[PDB]
Amino acid sequence: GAGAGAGMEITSSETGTNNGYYYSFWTDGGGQVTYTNGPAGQYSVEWSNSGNFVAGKGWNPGSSQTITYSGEWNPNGNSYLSVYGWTQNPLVEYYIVESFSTYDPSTGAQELGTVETDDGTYKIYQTTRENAPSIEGTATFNQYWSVRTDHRVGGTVTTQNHFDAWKNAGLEMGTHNYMIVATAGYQSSGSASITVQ
Ligand SMILES: O[C@@H]1[C@@H](O)[C@H](O[C@@H]2CO[C@@H](O)[C@H](O)[C@H]2O)OC[C@H]1O
Ligand SMILES: [Zn+2]
Ligand SMILES: [Zn+2]
């Protein structure tokens, strides 16, 4: 990753702004999850027998920008590399899944259609989270998925094409809160080093 350039190791949930990028590090506290901020839009995460975690850099609020990201994602088990964010009013968690490893996180949903963007095809899903952690505390909220059929690490995400496809499928979005290039994991180990450009 950033080698000597990695910032102080973070092992418990926190947010901030580092080198002009918003960063969110959330963990339920299972296993060992270690996050570091690098120069510019870089972050690194290393995990071992984790619980649930979601971490990365981007913007707060998000403004539907075209994202470019680079780097490496090396899971050993259940992990997702995604454009990840929240809307408020209504409260929505959303995922533009670039790669998943051993578990399709769209599992438990009727497919609502497809969007073709950034040289790939994404399947669209909606689910519900009940009494779940959120940017508002314990809450019930809609989850929207765009899941790339040809997994990749890096490239361009035109977030507005996803938002448009979701609105077209009848999925309402609120006021944008954060939007990051996230590494997520559950009951797994791995490492990732991702640069948001
Ligand atoms: O302290 C609270 C954080 O724990 C909360 O973090 C969210 C929890 O739900 C996860 O799905 C999200 O990824 C994470 O951002 O945000 C609100 C804060 O007060
Ligand atoms: Zn895959
Ligand atoms: Zn491919």
Give the mutation target among 26, 45, 127, 141 for probing the ligand 1 site: most ligand atoms within 8 A of CB: 26
- Going through the chain in order, the beta strands assigned E by DSSP cover 14-18, 21-27, 32-37, 42-48, 52-59, 66-76, 79-88, 92-100, 111-117, 120-132, 139-148, 155-158, 175-186, 189-196
| Strand, helix or coil for residue 5 | helix
Query: 133 in ligand 1 pocket by Cβ < 6 Å?
Result: yes
Atom of ligand 1 lying closest to residue 93 CA: 11
Nearest-angstrom CA–CA distance, 21 and 181: 11
Q: Which residue has a Cα nearest atom 15 of ligand 1?
A: 135
Confirm if 189 and 48 have CB atoms less than 8 A apart.
yes
Cα-based distances in Å from 149 to 69, 70, 99, 111, 126? 19, 19, 9, 13, 17
Residue 188 buriedness (CB in 10 A; 0-12 / 13-18 / 19+): buried
DSSP state of 119: T
| Strand, helix or coil for residue 43 | strand
Q: Which contiguous run of DSSP H or E holds residue 167?
A: helix 159-168
194 CA → ligand 3 middle, Å: 19
Amino acid at 104: D
Query: 27 in ligand 1 pocket by Cβ < 6 Å?
Result: no
**Entry resolution (Å):** 1.7
DSSP state of 39: S
Residue 46's DSSP bridge partners are: 34, 191
Domains, the chain:
3-196 (2.60.120.180)
Nearest-angstrom CA–CA distance, 132 and 166: 22
